Amino acid sequence: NTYRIDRLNTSSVKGRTSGVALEPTPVRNDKMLIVVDTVLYIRNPIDYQDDWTAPDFLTEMGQNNGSEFAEVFDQAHLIQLIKGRSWVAPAHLKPAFSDGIEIEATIDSD
Amino acid sequence: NTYRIDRLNTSSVKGRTSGVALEPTPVRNDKMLIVVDTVLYIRNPIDYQDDWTAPDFLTEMGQNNGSEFAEVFDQAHLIQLIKGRSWVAPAHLKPAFSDGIEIEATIDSD
Amino acid sequence: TDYAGNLTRPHWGGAASDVDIHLEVYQNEVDTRFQYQAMFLGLSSQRSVADRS
Amino acid sequence: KDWGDANANGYKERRAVLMNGIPVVECTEFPDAGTHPLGSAYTVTADDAKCRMVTFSKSRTLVTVEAKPFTSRIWDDEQNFANVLDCYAMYQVGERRPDTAAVVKFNE
Amino acid sequence: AAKAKDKQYEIVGKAQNLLKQVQPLYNVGFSTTALDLLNAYFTYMQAQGFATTRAGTGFVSDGAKLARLDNMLDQVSKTGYVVLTGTGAPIGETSGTAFDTSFTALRAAFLAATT
> Is D touching C (3+ C-beta pairs, cut-off 8 A)?
no
Give the H/E segment covering residue B48.
helix B48-52
**Cβ atoms of residues D10 and D3 within 8 Å:** yes
In this structure, what DSSP letter does residue A90 have? P
B83/B16 Cα distance (integer angstroms): 46
Q: List the helix and strand counts (H, then E) for chain E.
A: 4, 0
Alpha carbon separation from E4 to A62, C16, E82, E85 (Å, rounded) = 57, 21, 12, 16
Is the torsion defined by CA of E83, E87, E90, E95 positive or negative? negative
Chains touching chain D, criterion 3+ CB pairs below 8 Å? B, E
B17-42 b/e (C-beta count within 10 Å ≥ 16 → b): eeeeeeeeeebbbbbbbbbbbeebeb
Residue B82's alpha-carbon distances to B77, D1, D35, in angstroms, are 9, 35, 16
Nearest to D100 by CA among D45, D66, D70, D58: D58
Helix, strand, coil shares, percent, chain B, to 5: 30, 20, 55
Cβ contacts of residue E58 below 8 Å, gap of 6+?
Answer: E35, E114, E115
**What is the distance in angstroms between the Cα of E37 and the nearest Cα belonging to chain D?**
33
E93-113 and E64-77 helices, crossing angle to 10°: 160
Best CA proximity match to E103, nearest among E7, E19, E5, E8: E19
- The experimental technique behind this entry is cryo-EM
Chain E residue with minimum CA distance to B36: E87
Contact E54, E113 (CB under 8 A): no
Cβ-defined contact of E85 to B100 (cutoff 8 Å): no
Helix (H) or strand (E) holding A69: helix A58-83
Phi, psi values for residue D73, rounded to 5°: -135, 135
Nearest CA in chain B to E9: B90
List the single residue in C20, C23, C29 with the smallest CB-CB distance to A5. C29
* Residue whose C-alpha is closest to residue A11's, from A93, A99, A100, A90: A93
Do B48 and D91 make contact, defined as CB atoms within 8 angstroms? no
Q: Does B91 touch chain C (CB under 8 A)?
A: yes
| CA proximity to D16, closest of D60, D50, D62, D58 | D58
- Measured distance CA(E86)–CA(B36) in Å, rounded: 10
CA-based nearest residue to A4, from E71, C25, E73, E26: C25
Residue B107's identity, in one-letter code, is I
Which residues contact residue D103 at a Cβ distance below 8 angstroms, ignoring those fewer than 6 apart? B81, B82, B85, B101, B102, B103, D51, D53, D54, D55
- Contact: B32, E88; criterion CB under 8 Å: no
Cβ within 8 Å of residue C21, ≥6 positions away:
B30, B31, C11, C12, C13, C14, E17, E79
Could you give the CA distance from residue D41 to residue D47 in angstroms, rounded to a whole number?
A: 15
